[PDB]
Amino acid sequence: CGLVASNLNLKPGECLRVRGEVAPDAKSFVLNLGKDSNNLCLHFNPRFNAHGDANTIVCNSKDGGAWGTEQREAVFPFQPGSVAEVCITFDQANLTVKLPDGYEFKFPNRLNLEAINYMAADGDFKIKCVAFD
Amino acid sequence: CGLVASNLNLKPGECLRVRGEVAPDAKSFVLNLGKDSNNLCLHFNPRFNAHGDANTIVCNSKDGGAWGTEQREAVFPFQPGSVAEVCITFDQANLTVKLPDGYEFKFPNRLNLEAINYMAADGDFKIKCVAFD
Ligand SMILES: CC(=O)N[C@@H]1[C@@H](O[C@@H]2O[C@H](CO)[C@H](O)[C@H](O)[C@H]2O)[C@H](O)[C@@H](CO)O[C@H]1O
Ligand SMILES: CC(=O)N[C@@H]1[C@@H](O[C@@H]2O[C@H](CO)[C@H](O)[C@H](O)[C@H]2O)[C@H](O)[C@@H](CO)O[C@H]1O
């Protein structure tokens, strides 16, 4: 696995910023946010070439070990072999993810945790920088 | 406890940059670095006024759960209610903690691990930014 951080205590409205290097031959990377590995309010999974998907952002929740209903975006502002920054915040209704080119999407908040306490990165994304606001 | 990060994979010569908020009423804060919570190549513990120490940095190791022998500095460049930045690196001989204004603290490398994989903050220190170089 990649970087795992806990005790984040990220409250509604606070910004979590992650900057990393996307591998030149990247097939996929993951940012998981929530309470723990079984309880994710956001599974954020850009798929360059994985699970039969191409240049597709896949998002989901995981609640008590169970994947929720998957959602995808049409836009894919990531390139292999470049640096990517992602900024995440949430309120009780939605997570809001802002992407490098100013792209911003919302994913329903299905878990309604009081805070994001857990983040894990995986796959072809080398984290260089994590910041809190 | 404060932020805990694992799978850091920080190798010799690589630089861990941490910026945090020292609480206004700070009595003590901690940065722990090593393999896991029981194997610390550096316990970095500025004590403003705790355990009978005043404005003293206490450093130690922990090896398979057992604390080593404490090393202490006279020089104390931390202030309560402020922002502190440190840059940490290690080699075969020492861990080095550097502050921007040029303070440099060295602690013997007692564990000789291949990497720092674990970092944890505790006490009156709120981490706001972590970077890898
Ligand atoms: C179990 C399985 O393979 N599920 C398939 C999906 O792949 C998983 O998607 C989740 C997020 O929803 C995680 O990314 C997990 O790592 C993936 O294996 C796949 O996206 C969909 C659509 O093809 O099919 C599921 O069955
Ligand atoms: C159990 C205990 O209090 N040990 C004393 C030391 O305090 C601990 O020191 C370690 C680092 O070596 C950690 O900072 C831990 O949090 C502290 O409780 C204390 O520094 C010395 C002398 O002042 O005595 C030890 O027995």
Residue numbers in the entry:
A (entry chain A), B (entry chain B): 2 to 134
Wording from the paper:
Galectins, β-galactoside-binding proteins, are characteristic of having one or two conserved carbohydrate recognition domains (CRDs). Members of this family have been shown to participate in diverse biological functions, such as cell adhesion, cell growth regulation, and apoptosis via their interactions with β-galactoside-containing structures on cell surface, e.g., N-, O-linked glycoproteins, proteoglycans or glycolipids. To bridge this gap, we herein report the crystal structures including full-length human galectin-1 (hGal1), galectin-7 (hGal7) and the C-terminal CRD domain of galectin-3 (hGal3-CRD) in complex with LN1.
While only one monomer exists in the asymmetric unit of hGal3-CRD co-crystal, each asymmetric unit of hGal1 and hGal7 harbors a distinct symmetric dimer. Specifically, the dimer of hGal1 exists in a side-by-side manner, whereas hGal7 dimer is present in a back-to-back arrangement. Generally, hGal1 and hGal3 appear to have shorter distances (in average) in H-bonds to both GAL and GlcNAc moieties of LN2 than those of LN1. First, hGal1 and 7 have the electrostatic network consisting of Arg48hGal1/53hGal7, Asp54hGal1/Glu58hGal7, Glu71hGal1/72hGal7 and Arg73hGal1/74hGal7. These residues adopt dissimilar conformations and orientations when interacting with LN1 or LN2 molecules, while the corresponding network of hGal3-CRD (Arg162, Glu165, Glu184 and Arg186) interacts either with LN1 or LN2 in almost the same manner. A water was hold by Asp54hGal1, Arg73hGal1 and the N2 atom of GlcNAc in the hGal1/LN2 complex via formation of H-bonds, whereas Glu165hGal3 and the N2 of GlcNAc were observed to clamp a water molecule in the hGal3/LN2 complex. Since Asp54hGal1 and Glu165hGal3 residues mediate ionic interactions to their adjacent Arg residues, apparently the location of Asp54hGal1 and Glu165hGal3 results in the distinct conformation of L4 in hGal1 and hGal3-CRD.
